[PDB]
């Protein structure tokens with residue numbers, strides 16, 4: 001599973017998700033708010049595509065390993081996400 | 085690294101740089117890229133650009149993997165939505 005974090009360097013509230021394609025509604029149901037994610041852990045061999053807008057549209061930021069900082073553009077922008 | 089779209093062939097005219105992602109017509113226009121406008125593009129190494137004729141990634145699809153001074157006659161001024169990925 002992938003773990004998403006509120007704050008940089010794996011800080012604040014955290015929620016883990018198995019692979020899948022999660023819309024904003026599905027994220028909210030798992031207690032992940034909109035425009036909230038700052039860091040994440042990604043198991044080796046997995047890809048996380050973070051989308052700026054809902055339904056897997058808008059800018060996409062790709063992570064293939066643990067990161068304490070998603071970057072200036074990606075920070076607090078996650079609205080949908082694909083994990084595969 | 086970003087994809088730069090140009091108004092005219094040979095990287096001419098107005099230009100807009102875009103990060104990877106799946107952009108609908110609405111999102112393209114918000115990024116200041118008009119409909120049916122793109123004529124050439126620069127593509128970062130190892131990136132793929134899927135240019136769609138219609139909205140929501142439908143219609144004819146043209147694919148580019150390097151700097152392209154001439155998108156081709158069919159593709160020219162037809163970009164309405166686009167997927168950029170590595």
Ligand SMILES: [Ca+2]
Pocket residue numbers: 005006007008035036037038076
């Ligand atoms: Ca945050």
Ligand SMILES: [Ca+2]
Pocket residue numbers: 035051052053076077078079
């Ligand atoms: Ca967002």
Ligand SMILES: [Ca+2]
Pocket residue numbers: 090091092093120121122123161
């Ligand atoms: Ca043009």
Ligand SMILES: [Ca+2]
Pocket residue numbers: 120136137138161162163164
């Ligand atoms: Ca078109």
